[PDB]
PDB file of all heavy atoms in Angstrom:
ATOM      1  N   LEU A 273      -6.049  14.773  -9.565  1.00 28.80           N
ATOM      2  CA  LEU A 273      -6.210  13.397  -9.118  1.00 28.80           C
ATOM      3  C   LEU A 273      -6.437  13.244  -7.611  1.00 28.80           C
ATOM      4  O   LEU A 273      -7.304  12.465  -7.202  1.00 28.80           O
ATOM      5  CB  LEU A 273      -4.986  12.563  -9.551  1.00 28.80           C
ATOM      6  CG  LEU A 273      -5.041  11.971 -10.951  1.00 28.80           C
ATOM      7  CD1 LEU A 273      -4.154  10.744 -10.989  1.00 28.80           C
ATOM      8  CD2 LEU A 273      -6.448  11.584 -11.322  1.00 28.80           C
ATOM      9  N   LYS A 274      -5.641  13.947  -6.799  1.00 30.05           N
ATOM     10  CA  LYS A 274      -5.796  13.874  -5.326  1.00 30.05           C
ATOM     11  C   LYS A 274      -7.234  14.219  -4.958  1.00 30.05           C
ATOM     12  O   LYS A 274      -7.928  13.433  -4.295  1.00 30.05           O
ATOM     13  CB  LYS A 274      -4.816  14.809  -4.586  1.00 30.05           C
ATOM     14  CG  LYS A 274      -5.119  14.930  -3.053  1.00 30.05           C
ATOM     15  CD  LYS A 274      -5.036  16.377  -2.496  1.00 30.05           C
ATOM     16  CE  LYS A 274      -6.322  17.214  -2.768  1.00 30.05           C
ATOM     17  NZ  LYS A 274      -6.124  18.614  -2.313  1.00 30.05           N
ATOM     18  N   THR A 275      -7.688  15.374  -5.441  1.00 26.08           N
ATOM     19  CA  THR A 275      -9.049  15.861  -5.213  1.00 26.08           C
ATOM     20  C   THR A 275     -10.149  14.892  -5.666  1.00 26.08           C
ATOM     21  O   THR A 275     -11.089  14.632  -4.921  1.00 26.08           O
ATOM     22  CB  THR A 275      -9.247  17.230  -5.880  1.00 26.08           C
ATOM     23  OG1 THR A 275      -8.265  18.142  -5.388  1.00 26.08           O
ATOM     24  CG2 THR A 275     -10.621  17.788  -5.601  1.00 26.08           C
ATOM     25  N   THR A 276     -10.048  14.368  -6.882  1.00 23.55           N
ATOM     26  CA  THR A 276     -11.148  13.560  -7.435  1.00 23.55           C
ATOM     27  C   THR A 276     -11.174  12.160  -6.822  1.00 23.55           C
ATOM     28  O   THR A 276     -12.236  11.571  -6.678  1.00 23.55           O
ATOM     29  CB  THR A 276     -11.082  13.439  -8.972  1.00 23.55           C
ATOM     30  OG1 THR A 276      -9.795  12.938  -9.356  1.00 23.55           O
ATOM     31  CG2 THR A 276     -11.298  14.803  -9.642  1.00 23.55           C
ATOM     32  N   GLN A 277     -10.000  11.628  -6.475  1.00 23.40           N
ATOM     33  CA  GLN A 277      -9.935  10.324  -5.825  1.00 23.40           C
ATOM     34  C   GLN A 277     -10.696  10.347  -4.491  1.00 23.40           C
ATOM     35  O   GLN A 277     -11.267   9.347  -4.090  1.00 23.40           O
ATOM     36  CB  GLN A 277      -8.476   9.878  -5.641  1.00 23.40           C
ATOM     37  CG  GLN A 277      -8.289   8.482  -5.019  1.00 23.40           C
ATOM     38  CD  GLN A 277      -8.909   7.349  -5.852  1.00 23.40           C
ATOM     39  OE1 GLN A 277      -9.030   7.460  -7.077  1.00 23.40           O
ATOM     40  NE2 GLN A 277      -9.306   6.260  -5.185  1.00 23.40           N
ATOM     41  N   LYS A 278     -10.743  11.490  -3.812  1.00 21.10           N
ATOM     42  CA  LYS A 278     -11.429  11.517  -2.515  1.00 21.10           C
ATOM     43  C   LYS A 278     -12.951  11.682  -2.593  1.00 21.10           C
ATOM     44  O   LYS A 278     -13.618  11.605  -1.567  1.00 21.10           O
ATOM     45  CB  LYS A 278     -10.771  12.500  -1.538  1.00 21.10           C
ATOM     46  CG  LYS A 278     -11.201  13.914  -1.708  1.00 21.10           C
ATOM     47  CD  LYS A 278     -10.520  14.858  -0.679  1.00 21.10           C
ATOM     48  CE  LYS A 278     -11.089  16.293  -0.841  1.00 21.10           C
ATOM     49  NZ  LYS A 278     -12.500  16.400  -0.344  1.00 21.10           N
ATOM     50  N   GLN A 279     -13.505  11.912  -3.788  1.00 21.10           N
ATOM     51  CA  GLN A 279     -14.965  11.999  -3.932  1.00 21.10           C
ATOM     52  C   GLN A 279     -15.617  10.687  -4.379  1.00 21.10           C
ATOM     53  O   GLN A 279     -16.826  10.641  -4.618  1.00 21.10           O
ATOM     54  CB  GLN A 279     -15.388  13.105  -4.913  1.00 21.10           C
ATOM     55  CG  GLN A 279     -14.648  14.420  -4.818  1.00 21.10           C
ATOM     56  CD  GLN A 279     -14.590  15.018  -3.404  1.00 21.10           C
ATOM     57  OE1 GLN A 279     -13.540  15.526  -2.981  1.00 21.10           O
ATOM     58  NE2 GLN A 279     -15.700  14.985  -2.695  1.00 21.10           N
ATOM     59  N   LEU A 280     -14.827   9.636  -4.550  1.00 24.90           N
ATOM     60  CA  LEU A 280     -15.384   8.366  -5.020  1.00 24.90           C
ATOM     61  C   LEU A 280     -16.303   7.724  -3.962  1.00 24.90           C
ATOM     62  O   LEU A 280     -15.969   7.680  -2.778  1.00 24.90           O
ATOM     63  CB  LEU A 280     -14.265   7.426  -5.491  1.00 24.90           C
ATOM     64  CG  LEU A 280     -13.321   7.905  -6.618  1.00 24.90           C
ATOM     65  CD1 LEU A 280     -12.275   6.833  -6.960  1.00 24.90           C
ATOM     66  CD2 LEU A 280     -14.044   8.371  -7.898  1.00 24.90           C
ATOM     67  N   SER A 281     -17.472   7.273  -4.407  1.00 26.81           N
ATOM     68  CA  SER A 281     -18.609   6.849  -3.552  1.00 26.81           C
ATOM     69  C   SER A 281     -19.408   7.969  -2.846  1.00 26.81           C
ATOM     70  O   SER A 281     -20.468   7.710  -2.268  1.00 26.81           O
ATOM     71  CB  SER A 281     -18.222   5.705  -2.592  1.00 26.81           C
ATOM     72  OG  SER A 281     -17.332   6.153  -1.569  1.00 26.81           O
ATOM     73  N   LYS A 282     -18.936   9.214  -2.933  1.00 31.21           N
ATOM     74  CA  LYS A 282     -19.655  10.376  -2.383  1.00 31.21           C
ATOM     75  C   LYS A 282     -20.868  10.771  -3.216  1.00 31.21           C
ATOM     76  O   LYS A 282     -20.965  10.425  -4.380  1.00 31.21           O
ATOM     77  CB  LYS A 282     -18.708  11.569  -2.237  1.00 31.21           C
ATOM     78  CG  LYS A 282     -18.069  11.738  -0.866  1.00 31.21           C
ATOM     79  CD  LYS A 282     -17.450  10.436  -0.327  1.00 31.21           C
ATOM     80  CE  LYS A 282     -17.192  10.513   1.205  1.00 31.21           C
ATOM     81  NZ  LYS A 282     -16.399   9.354   1.753  1.00 31.21           N
ATOM     82  N   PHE A 283     -21.791  11.507  -2.628  1.00 30.58           N
ATOM     83  CA  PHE A 283     -22.989  11.932  -3.335  1.00 30.58           C
ATOM     84  C   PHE A 283     -22.866  13.347  -3.914  1.00 30.58           C
ATOM     85  O   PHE A 283     -22.157  14.199  -3.360  1.00 30.58           O
ATOM     86  CB  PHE A 283     -24.238  11.722  -2.449  1.00 30.58           C
ATOM     87  CG  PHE A 283     -24.679  10.266  -2.383  1.00 30.58           C
ATOM     88  CD1 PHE A 283     -23.895   9.311  -1.713  1.00 30.58           C
ATOM     89  CD2 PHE A 283     -25.830   9.838  -3.054  1.00 30.58           C
ATOM     90  CE1 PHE A 283     -24.273   7.957  -1.677  1.00 30.58           C
ATOM     91  CE2 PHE A 283     -26.217   8.480  -3.028  1.00 30.58           C
ATOM     92  CZ  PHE A 283     -25.438   7.545  -2.337  1.00 30.58           C
ATOM     93  N   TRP A 284     -23.536  13.585  -5.043  1.00 27.22           N
ATOM     94  CA  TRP A 284     -23.439  14.873  -5.761  1.00 27.22           C
ATOM     95  C   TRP A 284     -24.212  15.970  -5.067  1.00 27.22           C
ATOM     96  O   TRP A 284     -25.371  16.250  -5.429  1.00 27.22           O
ATOM     97  CB  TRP A 284     -23.927  14.734  -7.217  1.00 27.22           C
ATOM     98  CG  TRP A 284     -23.291  15.725  -8.161  1.00 27.22           C
ATOM     99  CD1 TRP A 284     -23.887  16.809  -8.747  1.00 27.22           C
ATOM    100  CD2 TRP A 284     -21.942  15.703  -8.640  1.00 27.22           C
ATOM    101  NE1 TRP A 284     -22.981  17.473  -9.547  1.00 27.22           N
ATOM    102  CE2 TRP A 284     -21.782  16.813  -9.499  1.00 27.22           C
ATOM    103  CE3 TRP A 284     -20.850  14.855  -8.421  1.00 27.22           C
ATOM    104  CZ2 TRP A 284     -20.585  17.079 -10.152  1.00 27.22           C
ATOM    105  CZ3 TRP A 284     -19.646  15.142  -9.043  1.00 27.22           C
ATOM    106  CH2 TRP A 284     -19.524  16.233  -9.911  1.00 27.22           C
ATOM    107  N   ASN A 285     -23.577  16.604  -4.079  1.00 28.16           N
ATOM    108  CA  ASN A 285     -24.257  17.635  -3.290  1.00 28.16           C
ATOM    109  C   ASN A 285     -23.367  18.777  -2.792  1.00 28.16           C
ATOM    110  O   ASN A 285     -22.196  18.847  -3.131  1.00 28.16           O
ATOM    111  CB  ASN A 285     -25.020  16.981  -2.129  1.00 28.16           C
ATOM    112  CG  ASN A 285     -24.121  16.224  -1.177  1.00 28.16           C
ATOM    113  OD1 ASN A 285     -22.918  16.501  -1.051  1.00 28.16           O
ATOM    114  ND2 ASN A 285     -24.711  15.253  -0.483  1.00 28.16           N
ATOM    115  N   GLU A 286     -23.932  19.672  -1.985  1.00 28.81           N
ATOM    116  CA  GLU A 286     -23.176  20.838  -1.481  1.00 28.81           C
ATOM    117  C   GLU A 286     -21.897  20.470  -0.752  1.00 28.81           C
ATOM    118  O   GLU A 286     -20.924  21.212  -0.780  1.00 28.81           O
ATOM    119  CB  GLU A 286     -24.056  21.715  -0.603  1.00 28.81           C
ATOM    120  CG  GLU A 286     -25.110  22.468  -1.399  1.00 28.81           C
ATOM    121  CD  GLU A 286     -26.121  23.187  -0.522  1.00 28.81           C
ATOM    122  OE1 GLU A 286     -25.695  23.965   0.390  1.00 28.81           O
ATOM    123  OE2 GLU A 286     -27.349  22.987  -0.758  1.00 28.81           O
ATOM    124  N   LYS A 287     -21.887  19.312  -0.115  1.00 28.71           N
ATOM    125  CA  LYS A 287     -20.707  18.870   0.616  1.00 28.71           C
ATOM    126  C   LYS A 287     -19.599  18.461  -0.354  1.00 28.71           C
ATOM    127  O   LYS A 287     -18.427  18.783  -0.129  1.00 28.71           O
ATOM    128  CB  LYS A 287     -21.066  17.738   1.595  1.00 28.71           C
ATOM    129  CG  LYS A 287     -19.896  16.861   2.051  1.00 28.71           C
ATOM    130  CD  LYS A 287     -19.087  17.486   3.188  1.00 28.71           C
ATOM    131  CE  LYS A 287     -18.105  16.445   3.767  1.00 28.71           C
ATOM    132  NZ  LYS A 287     -16.979  17.120   4.460  1.00 28.71           N
ATOM    133  N   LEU A 288     -19.965  17.763  -1.433  1.00 29.16           N
ATOM    134  CA  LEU A 288     -19.012  17.444  -2.491  1.00 29.16           C
ATOM    135  C   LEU A 288     -18.469  18.715  -3.171  1.00 29.16           C
ATOM    136  O   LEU A 288     -17.284  18.812  -3.434  1.00 29.16           O
ATOM    137  CB  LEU A 288     -19.654  16.493  -3.504  1.00 29.16           C
ATOM    138  CG  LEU A 288     -18.865  16.064  -4.748  1.00 29.16           C
ATOM    139  CD1 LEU A 288     -19.217  14.631  -5.129  1.00 29.16           C
ATOM    140  CD2 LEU A 288     -19.117  17.053  -5.898  1.00 29.16           C
ATOM    141  N   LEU A 289     -19.344  19.682  -3.426  1.00 26.80           N
ATOM    142  CA  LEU A 289     -18.940  20.965  -4.004  1.00 26.80           C
ATOM    143  C   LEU A 289     -17.877  21.643  -3.142  1.00 26.80           C
ATOM    144  O   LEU A 289     -16.823  22.034  -3.656  1.00 26.80           O
ATOM    145  CB  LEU A 289     -20.156  21.886  -4.174  1.00 26.80           C
ATOM    146  CG  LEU A 289     -19.876  23.331  -4.608  1.00 26.80           C
ATOM    147  CD1 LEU A 289     -19.039  23.396  -5.864  1.00 26.80           C
ATOM    148  CD2 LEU A 289     -21.197  24.119  -4.771  1.00 26.80           C
ATOM    149  N   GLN A 290     -18.154  21.768  -1.834  1.00 26.02           N
ATOM    150  CA  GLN A 290     -17.203  22.350  -0.868  1.00 26.02           C
ATOM    151  C   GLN A 290     -15.863  21.610  -0.905  1.00 26.02           C
ATOM    152  O   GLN A 290     -14.785  22.219  -0.902  1.00 26.02           O
ATOM    153  CB  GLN A 290     -17.764  22.210   0.558  1.00 26.02           C
ATOM    154  CG  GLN A 290     -18.404  23.432   1.148  1.00 26.02           C
ATOM    155  CD  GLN A 290     -18.012  23.669   2.635  1.00 26.02           C
ATOM    156  OE1 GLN A 290     -17.277  22.884   3.256  1.00 26.02           O
ATOM    157  NE2 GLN A 290     -18.511  24.766   3.194  1.00 26.02           N
ATOM    158  N   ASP A 291     -15.937  20.285  -0.924  1.00 26.63           N
ATOM    159  CA  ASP A 291     -14.742  19.470  -0.761  1.00 26.63           C
ATOM    160  C   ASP A 291     -13.907  19.498  -2.027  1.00 26.63           C
ATOM    161  O   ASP A 291     -12.676  19.528  -1.971  1.00 26.63           O
ATOM    162  CB  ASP A 291     -15.125  18.031  -0.395  1.00 26.63           C
ATOM    163  CG  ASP A 291     -15.722  17.896   1.022  1.00 26.63           C
ATOM    164  OD1 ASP A 291     -15.584  18.821   1.867  1.00 26.63           O
ATOM    165  OD2 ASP A 291     -16.310  16.812   1.301  1.00 26.63           O
ATOM    166  N   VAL A 292     -14.573  19.499  -3.186  1.00 29.38           N
ATOM    167  CA  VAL A 292     -13.842  19.574  -4.453  1.00 29.38           C
ATOM    168  C   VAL A 292     -13.220  20.972  -4.560  1.00 29.38           C
ATOM    169  O   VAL A 292     -12.042  21.122  -4.860  1.00 29.38           O
ATOM    170  CB  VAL A 292     -14.734  19.247  -5.685  1.00 29.38           C
ATOM    171  CG1 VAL A 292     -14.002  19.562  -6.978  1.00 29.38           C
ATOM    172  CG2 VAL A 292     -15.119  17.799  -5.696  1.00 29.38           C
ATOM    173  N   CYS A 293     -14.008  21.995  -4.285  1.00 30.52           N
ATOM    174  CA  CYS A 293     -13.453  23.352  -4.256  1.00 30.52           C
ATOM    175  C   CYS A 293     -12.248  23.512  -3.286  1.00 30.52           C
ATOM    176  O   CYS A 293     -11.270  24.179  -3.624  1.00 30.52           O
ATOM    177  CB  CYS A 293     -14.553  24.366  -3.980  1.00 30.52           C
ATOM    178  SG  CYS A 293     -15.580  24.654  -5.434  1.00 30.52           S
ATOM    179  N   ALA A 294     -12.304  22.898  -2.103  1.00 31.67           N
ATOM    180  CA  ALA A 294     -11.146  22.899  -1.196  1.00 31.67           C
ATOM    181  C   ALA A 294      -9.931  22.148  -1.758  1.00 31.67           C
ATOM    182  O   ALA A 294      -8.781  22.578  -1.599  1.00 31.67           O
ATOM    183  CB  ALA A 294     -11.538  22.328   0.174  1.00 31.67           C
ATOM    184  N   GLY A 295     -10.181  21.030  -2.429  1.00 26.50           N
ATOM    185  CA  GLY A 295      -9.087  20.239  -2.993  1.00 26.50           C
ATOM    186  C   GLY A 295      -8.474  20.972  -4.172  1.00 26.50           C
ATOM    187  O   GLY A 295      -7.248  20.983  -4.337  1.00 26.50           O
ATOM    188  N   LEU A 296      -9.330  21.589  -4.993  1.00 26.20           N
ATOM    189  CA  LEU A 296      -8.851  22.341  -6.149  1.00 26.20           C
ATOM    190  C   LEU A 296      -8.005  23.535  -5.726  1.00 26.20           C
ATOM    191  O   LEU A 296      -6.932  23.760  -6.290  1.00 26.20           O
ATOM    192  CB  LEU A 296     -10.016  22.798  -7.028  1.00 26.20           C
ATOM    193  CG  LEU A 296     -10.759  21.713  -7.797  1.00 26.20           C
ATOM    194  CD1 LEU A 296     -11.920  22.363  -8.540  1.00 26.20           C
ATOM    195  CD2 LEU A 296      -9.827  21.010  -8.772  1.00 26.20           C
ATOM    196  N   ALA A 297      -8.490  24.285  -4.739  1.00 28.00           N
ATOM    197  CA  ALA A 297      -7.746  25.427  -4.204  1.00 28.00           C
ATOM    198  C   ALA A 297      -6.351  24.993  -3.784  1.00 28.00           C
ATOM    199  O   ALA A 297      -5.393  25.686  -4.062  1.00 28.00           O
ATOM    200  CB  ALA A 297      -8.484  26.082  -3.033  1.00 28.00           C
ATOM    201  N   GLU A 298      -6.237  23.823  -3.163  1.00 26.56           N
ATOM    202  CA  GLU A 298      -4.946  23.341  -2.665  1.00 26.56           C
ATOM    203  C   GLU A 298      -4.083  22.715  -3.753  1.00 26.56           C
ATOM    204  O   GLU A 298      -2.961  23.146  -3.983  1.00 26.56           O
ATOM    205  CB  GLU A 298      -5.145  22.357  -1.520  1.00 26.56           C
ATOM    206  CG  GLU A 298      -3.841  21.998  -0.840  1.00 26.56           C
ATOM    207  CD  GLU A 298      -4.016  21.034   0.320  1.00 26.56           C
ATOM    208  OE1 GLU A 298      -5.063  21.113   1.007  1.00 26.56           O
ATOM    209  OE2 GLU A 298      -3.098  20.204   0.550  1.00 26.56           O
ATOM    210  N   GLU A 299      -4.609  21.700  -4.426  1.00 25.50           N
ATOM    211  CA  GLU A 299      -3.857  20.967  -5.452  1.00 25.50           C
ATOM    212  C   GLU A 299      -3.386  21.821  -6.631  1.00 25.50           C
ATOM    213  O   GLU A 299      -2.279  21.612  -7.145  1.00 25.50           O
ATOM    214  CB  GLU A 299      -4.693  19.803  -5.968  1.00 25.50           C
ATOM    215  CG  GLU A 299      -3.909  18.793  -6.781  1.00 25.50           C
ATOM    216  CD  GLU A 299      -4.700  17.526  -7.033  1.00 25.50           C
ATOM    217  OE1 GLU A 299      -5.943  17.560  -6.864  1.00 25.50           O
ATOM    218  OE2 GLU A 299      -4.074  16.503  -7.414  1.00 25.50           O
ATOM    219  N   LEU A 300      -4.209  22.772  -7.067  1.00 21.84           N
ATOM    220  CA  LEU A 300      -3.821  23.615  -8.205  1.00 21.84           C
ATOM    221  C   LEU A 300      -3.298  24.997  -7.770  1.00 21.84           C
ATOM    222  O   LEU A 300      -3.211  25.912  -8.603  1.00 21.84           O
ATOM    223  CB  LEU A 300      -4.959  23.770  -9.239  1.00 21.84           C
ATOM    224  CG  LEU A 300      -5.802  22.557  -9.666  1.00 21.84           C
ATOM    225  CD1 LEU A 300      -6.744  22.922 -10.776  1.00 21.84           C
ATOM    226  CD2 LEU A 300      -4.950  21.369 -10.091  1.00 21.84           C
ATOM    227  N   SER A 301      -2.939  25.139  -6.489  1.00 19.79           N
ATOM    228  CA  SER A 301      -2.457  26.433  -5.980  1.00 19.79           C
ATOM    229  C   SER A 301      -1.212  26.876  -6.724  1.00 19.79           C
ATOM    230  O   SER A 301      -0.358  26.054  -7.076  1.00 19.79           O
ATOM    231  CB  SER A 301      -2.210  26.392  -4.473  1.00 19.79           C
ATOM    232  OG  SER A 301      -1.222  25.425  -4.150  1.00 19.79           O
ATOM    233  N   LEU A 302      -1.132  28.178  -6.984  1.00 19.72           N
ATOM    234  CA  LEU A 302      -0.063  28.769  -7.763  1.00 19.72           C
ATOM    235  C   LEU A 302       0.754  29.655  -6.850  1.00 19.72           C
ATOM    236  O   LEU A 302       0.184  30.425  -6.089  1.00 19.72           O
ATOM    237  CB  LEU A 302      -0.660  29.627  -8.887  1.00 19.72           C
ATOM    238  CG  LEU A 302      -1.507  28.967  -9.990  1.00 19.72           C
ATOM    239  CD1 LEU A 302      -2.379  30.003 -10.746  1.00 19.72           C
ATOM    240  CD2 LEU A 302      -0.625  28.224 -10.933  1.00 19.72           C
ATOM    241  N   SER A 303       2.081  29.576  -6.939  1.00 17.55           N
ATOM    242  CA  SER A 303       2.933  30.502  -6.187  1.00 17.55           C
ATOM    243  C   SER A 303       2.726  31.912  -6.731  1.00 17.55           C
ATOM    244  O   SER A 303       2.408  32.068  -7.905  1.00 17.55           O
ATOM    245  CB  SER A 303       4.405  30.110  -6.292  1.00 17.55           C
ATOM    246  OG  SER A 303       4.960  30.529  -7.527  1.00 17.55           O
ATOM    247  N   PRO A 304       2.897  32.943  -5.889  1.00 17.12           N
ATOM    248  CA  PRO A 304       2.683  34.335  -6.319  1.00 17.12           C
ATOM    249  C   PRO A 304       3.472  34.711  -7.576  1.00 17.12           C
ATOM    250  O   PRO A 304       3.051  35.591  -8.339  1.00 17.12           O
ATOM    251  CB  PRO A 304       3.203  35.140  -5.134  1.00 17.12           C
ATOM    252  CG  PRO A 304       2.977  34.236  -3.946  1.00 17.12           C
ATOM    253  CD  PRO A 304       3.300  32.863  -4.470  1.00 17.12           C
ATOM    254  N   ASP A 305       4.596  34.025  -7.785  1.00 17.28           N
ATOM    255  CA  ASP A 305       5.479  34.274  -8.912  1.00 17.28           C
ATOM    256  C   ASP A 305       5.252  33.319 -10.084  1.00 17.28           C
ATOM    257  O   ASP A 305       6.116  33.199 -10.957  1.00 17.28           O
ATOM    258  CB  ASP A 305       6.952  34.201  -8.451  1.00 17.28           C
ATOM    259  CG  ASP A 305       7.310  35.293  -7.430  1.00 17.28           C
ATOM    260  OD1 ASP A 305       6.664  36.378  -7.453  1.00 17.28           O
ATOM    261  OD2 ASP A 305       8.243  35.073  -6.604  1.00 17.28           O
ATOM    262  N   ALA A 306       4.103  32.641 -10.111  1.00 13.30           N
ATOM    263  CA  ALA A 306       3.848  31.630 -11.142  1.00 13.30           C
ATOM    264  C   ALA A 306       3.945  32.300 -12.508  1.00 13.30           C
ATOM    265  O   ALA A 306       3.547  33.466 -12.650  1.00 13.30           O
ATOM    266  CB  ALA A 306       2.487  30.967 -10.954  1.00 13.30           C
ATOM    267  N   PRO A 307       4.517  31.586 -13.505  1.00 15.17           N
ATOM    268  CA  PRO A 307       4.628  32.146 -14.853  1.00 15.17           C
ATOM    269  C   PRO A 307       3.228  32.423 -15.382  1.00 15.17           C
ATOM    270  O   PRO A 307       2.351  31.575 -15.248  1.00 15.17           O
ATOM    271  CB  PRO A 307       5.296  31.024 -15.648  1.00 15.17           C
ATOM    272  CG  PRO A 307       5.979  30.172 -14.631  1.00 15.17           C
ATOM    273  CD  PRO A 307       5.083  30.222 -13.434  1.00 15.17           C
ATOM    274  N   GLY A 308       3.016  33.620 -15.921  1.00 15.60           N
ATOM    275  CA  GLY A 308       1.712  33.990 -16.471  1.00 15.60           C
ATOM    276  C   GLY A 308       0.861  34.874 -15.579  1.00 15.60           C
ATOM    277  O   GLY A 308      -0.139  35.421 -16.046  1.00 15.60           O
ATOM    278  N   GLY A 309       1.222  34.979 -14.291  1.00 19.00           N
ATOM    279  CA  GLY A 309       0.490  35.840 -13.342  1.00 19.00           C
ATOM    280  C   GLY A 309      -0.999  35.499 -13.315  1.00 19.00           C
ATOM    281  O   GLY A 309      -1.367  34.338 -13.466  1.00 19.00           O
ATOM    282  N   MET A 310      -1.858  36.505 -13.149  1.00 18.28           N
ATOM    283  CA  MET A 310      -3.314  36.273 -13.029  1.00 18.28           C
ATOM    284  C   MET A 310      -3.651  35.193 -12.002  1.00 18.28           C
ATOM    285  O   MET A 310      -4.556  34.392 -12.232  1.00 18.28           O
ATOM    286  CB  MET A 310      -3.900  35.849 -14.367  1.00 18.28           C
ATOM    287  CG  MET A 310      -3.989  36.960 -15.346  1.00 18.28           C
ATOM    288  SD  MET A 310      -4.574  36.341 -16.906  1.00 18.28           S
ATOM    289  CE  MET A 310      -5.423  37.798 -17.469  1.00 18.28           C
ATOM    290  N   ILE A 311      -2.911  35.189 -10.889  1.00 18.64           N
ATOM    291  CA  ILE A 311      -2.914  34.100  -9.917  1.00 18.64           C
ATOM    292  C   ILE A 311      -4.301  33.889  -9.316  1.00 18.64           C
ATOM    293  O   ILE A 311      -4.807  32.761  -9.298  1.00 18.64           O
ATOM    294  CB  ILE A 311      -1.882  34.349  -8.762  1.00 18.64           C
ATOM    295  CG1 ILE A 311      -0.461  34.563  -9.320  1.00 18.64           C
ATOM    296  CG2 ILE A 311      -1.895  33.199  -7.752  1.00 18.64           C
ATOM    297  CD1 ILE A 311       0.091  33.392 -10.050  1.00 18.64           C
TER     298      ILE A 311
END
């Protein structure tokens, strides 16, 4: 939600790709000890 809320009114381009990828990396980040590994 944090990530997608910040792309509203933005255009579908390389800048949106970068920004969504940055938000995803942060918002869905897993601690090294996350259950299931494959971090």
Side-chain angles (χ1 to χ4, degrees):
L273 274 205
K274 170 223 81 185
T275 304
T276 54
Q277 183 61 28
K278 83 179 184 72
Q279 318 308 138
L280 302 180
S281 70
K282 265 49 197 189
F283 283 69
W284 207 252
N285 61 25
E286 289 172 52
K287 159 82 169 158
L288 177 146
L289 173 54
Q290 259 223 358
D291 291 344
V292 171
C293 284
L296 290 177
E298 189 179 327
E299 194 168 17
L300 317 186
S301 61
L302 296 162
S303 79
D305 296 333
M310 287 176 149
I311 304 297

